[PDB]
């Protein structure tokens, strides 16, 4: 209901109380499932509202009458789950000194909680919402360079391939995929404070997945339900083409409204096997899609917000991708790679022998790793990226011997090549393998993961100089501290697990006594 100036009429989405917990479609009408027709322009449809009008929010004013306020200013605050305290803040655009500001009470969303005068004059009235075209990137002061890690306490993507607090990753294959579980370890785990899950398609036709067991799921961070901070943008297949394209611009705009506030935010972008139709055309001009997509993209980072006090907040953003064949090497594959900073390479392989995360580790990478490491070096640990790499090494340097034993066979390897492998292995089940389902190794704390990065690589430097001072591998390979290795990840105490480095040391010590110099 509005012009024709360019991009299809308003277009837009309501911020405020009750977006969280909110079930929506991909243009936020509240869930019962239906449907939008269009191209370019517009829609048709049904009655349902947004944020609720009934519903009444108590009202906190973080401001008074005489203050000066700037587009993003918080001139209040409202509890609206036990976990997010939702901020009021004047929408970008609109400056002045406040005239009129509501009084601690309880108001419905229609109400006018401020009043403020512009410059010119003009009196603006203020609710405790607003409006949004989704299509347009929420407004922000500076977009701030990768440099603060989202700390996923999954081991091999906080160590090998780092997401940037507004970064972008990718992930194979849908979301709703029961073969791997890192997906929903991401949604719950990272240290984003609001997630805003885009769950693309859906299974069979009994209707019950993704809608039912999710008011019931737990965060495990709070013990408070984790529909409490999620905002749930439900893309089904009976839905129409058009609501499901918008829904991605919905779920974007949403996150830049928390991330205003000072927030972090993860935006989970579904994805299924479906041929968009581009390869419909013939004469009247494609690759334009490629574009709009990195400007979806684009649309990612961490931010100093707008307002008068300083103020950060990011949206790192993470896309499935599912080529329609498996295959690839389909465009959508090509060229989601060509604009995310992070692919995690999710493995068929993997997931078969049972190694878990089934994320590649050499077919998967971060461009964030340098971005980061000055985190990780200043808060947890100076020798992180050191570290990292030298572990890359032994992994890379493991694929080479796989490659040649698989030719050649294992019996001629000498002493000091098969110590590699011993040690790799250890790499992979003690560090890289994490169980999700552990209620101790479901979530590994940068402290923990440092500590367990250097008891395997002091047992390794251990193990080289033990082979070079002629003990054998056999001797190295029953060492007592092993047992105690392979099952660090399981201890809560962080110390203890440091002390396994002394241990090693003395192990060793009596070993290299055992073989007099
Ligand atoms: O569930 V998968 O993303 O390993 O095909
Ligand atoms: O993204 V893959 O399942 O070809 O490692």
Same mark, same amino acid.
């Given at each position: 209901?509005?012009?024709?100036?360019?991009?299809?009429?308003?277009?837009?989405?309501?911020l405020?109380?009750?977006?969280?917990?909110?079930?929506?479609?991909?243009?936020?009408?509240?869930?019962?499932?239906? !449907?939008? #027709?269009?191209?370019?322009? *517009?829609?048709?449809?049904?009655?349902?509202?947004?944020?609720?009008?009934?519903?009444?929010w108590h009202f906190?004013?973080?401001?008074?009458v005489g203050?000066?306020? %700037?587009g993003?200013?918080?001139?209040?605050?409202?509890?609206?789950t036990?976990?997010?305290?939702?901020?009021?803040?004047?929408?970008?655009? +609109?400056?002045?000194? +406040?005239?009129?500001?509501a009084?601690?009470?309880?108001?419905?969303?229609?109400? /006018?909680?401020?009043?403020?005068?512009?410059?010119?004059?003009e *009196?603006?009235?203020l609710?405790?919402?607003?409006?949004?075209?989704?299509?347009?990137?929420?407004?922000?002061?500076?977009?701030?360079?990768?440099?603060?890690?989202?700390?996923?306490?999954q081991?091999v993507?906080?160590?090998?391939?780092?997401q940037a607090?507004?970064?972008?990753?990718? +992930?194979?294959?849908?979301?709703?995929?029961?073969?791997?579980?890192?997906?929903?370890?991401?949604?719950?785990?990272?240290?984003?404070?609001?997630?805003? =899950? +885009?769950?693309?398609?859906?299974?069979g036709?009994?209707?019950?997945d993704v809608?039912?067991?999710?008011?019931?799921?737990?965060?495990?961070?709070?013990?408070?339900?984790?529909?409490?901070?999620? /905002?749930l *943008?439900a893309?089904?297949? &009976?839905?129409?083409?058009?609501?499901?394209?918008?829904?991605?611009?919905?779920?974007?705009?949403?996150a830049?409204?928390?991330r205003?506030?000072?927030?972090?935010v993860?935006?989970?972008?579904?994805?299924?096997s479906?041929?968009? @139709?581009?390869? !419909?055309?013939?004469?009247?001009?494609?690759?334009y899609?490629?574009?709009?997509?990195?400007?979806? =993209?684009?649309?990612?980072?961490?931010? /100093?917000?707008?307002?008068?006090?300083? !103020?950060?907040?990011? %949206?790192?953003?993470?896309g499935?991708?599912?080529?329609?064949?498996?295959?690839?090497?389909?465009?959508?594959?090509? &060229?989601?790679?060509?604009?995310?900073?992070?692919?995690?390479?999710?493995?068929?392989?993997?997931?078969?022998?049972?190694?878990?995360?089934?994320? &590649?580790?050499?077919?998967?990478?971060?461009?964030?790793?340098?971005?980061?490491?000055?985190?990780?070096?200043? &808060?947890?640990?100076?020798?992180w #990226?050191?570290?990292?790499?030298?572990?890359?090494?032994?992994?890379? #340097?493991?694929?080479?011997?796989?490659?040649?034993?698989? *030719?050649?066979?294992?019996?001629?390897?000498?002493?000091?090549?098969?110590?590699?492998?011993?040690?790799?292995?250890?790499?992979?089940?003690?560090?890289?393998?994490?169980?999700?389902?552990? @209620?101790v190794?479901? =979530?590994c704390?940068?402290?923990?993961?440092?500590?367990?990065?250097?008891?395997?690589?002091?047992?390794?430097?251990?193990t080289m100089?033990?082979?070079?001072r002629?003990?054998?591998?056999?001797?190295?390979?029953?060492?007592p501290?092993?047992?105690?290795?392979?099952?660090?990840?399981?201890?809560?105490d962080?110390?203890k697990?440091?002390?396994?480095?002394?241990?090693?040391?003395?192990?060793?010590?009596?070993?290299?006594?055992?073989?007099?110099?």
């Open positions: 209901g509005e012009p024709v100036v360019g991009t299809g009429a308003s277009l837009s989405v309501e405020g109380p009750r977006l969280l917990t909110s079930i929506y479609d991909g243009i936020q009408r509240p869930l019962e499932v239906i !449907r939008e #027709k269009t191209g370019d322009f *517009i829609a048709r449809g049904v009655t349902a509202p947004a944020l609720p009008r009934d519903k009444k906190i004013p973080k401001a008074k203050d000066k306020v %700037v993003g200013d918080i001139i209040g605050e409202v509890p609206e036990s976990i997010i305290v939702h901020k009021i803040m004047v929408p970008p655009g +609109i400056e002045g000194e +406040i005239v009129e500001i009084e601690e009470g309880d108001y419905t969303i229609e109400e /006018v909680i401020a009043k403020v005068k512009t410059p010119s004059g *009196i603006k009235e609710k405790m919402y607003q409006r949004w075209p989704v299509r347009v990137k929420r407004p922000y002061k500076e977009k701030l360079p990768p440099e603060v890690p989202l700390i996923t306490g081991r993507i906080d160590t090998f391939f780092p607090k507004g970064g972008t990753a990718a +992930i194979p294959g849908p979301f709703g995929s029961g073969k791997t579980v890192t997906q929903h370890q991401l949604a719950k785990w990272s240290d984003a404070q609001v997630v805003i =899950y +885009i769950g693309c398609g859906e299974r036709n009994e209707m019950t809608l039912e067991e999710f008011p019931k799921l737990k965060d495990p961070k709070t013990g408070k339900p984790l529909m409490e901070r999620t /905002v *943008i893309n089904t297949s &009976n839905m129409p083409v058009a609501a499901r394209e918008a829904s991605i611009y919905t779920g974007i705009t949403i830049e409204y928390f205003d506030m000072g927030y972090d993860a935006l989970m972008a579904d994805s299924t479906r041929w968009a @139709e581009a390869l !419909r055309e013939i004469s009247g001009r494609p690759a899609l490629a574009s709009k997509l990195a400007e979806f =993209y684009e649309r990612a980072g961490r931010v /100093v917000t707008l307002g008068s006090d300083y !103020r950060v907040g990011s %949206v790192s953003v993470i499935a991708v599912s080529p329609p064949g498996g295959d690839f090497s389909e465009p959508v594959v090509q &060229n989601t790679l060509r604009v995310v900073k992070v692919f995690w390479a999710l493995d068929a392989d993997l997931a078969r022998r049972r190694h878990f995360p089934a994320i &590649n580790w050499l077919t998967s990478y971060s461009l964030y790793v340098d971005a980061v490491k000055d985190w990780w070096h200043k &808060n947890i640990d100076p020798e #990226k050191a570290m990292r790499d030298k572990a890359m090494a032994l992994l890379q #340097k493991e694929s080479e011997l796989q490659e040649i034993v698989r *030719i050649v066979g294992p019996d001629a390897l000498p002493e000091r090549e098969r110590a590699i492998l011993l040690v790799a292995r250890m790499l992979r089940e003690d560090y890289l393998q994490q169980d999700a389902f552990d @209620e190794d479901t =979530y704390p940068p402290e923990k993961q440092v500590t367990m990065m250097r008891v395997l690589l002091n047992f390794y430097d251990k100089e033990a082979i070079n002629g003990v054998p591998l056999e001797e190295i390979a029953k060492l501290v092993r047992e105690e290795i392979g099952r660090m990840k399981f201890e809560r962080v110390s697990i440091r002390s396994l480095i002394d241990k090693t040391n003395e192990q060793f010590e009596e070993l290299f006594k055992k073989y007099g110099a």
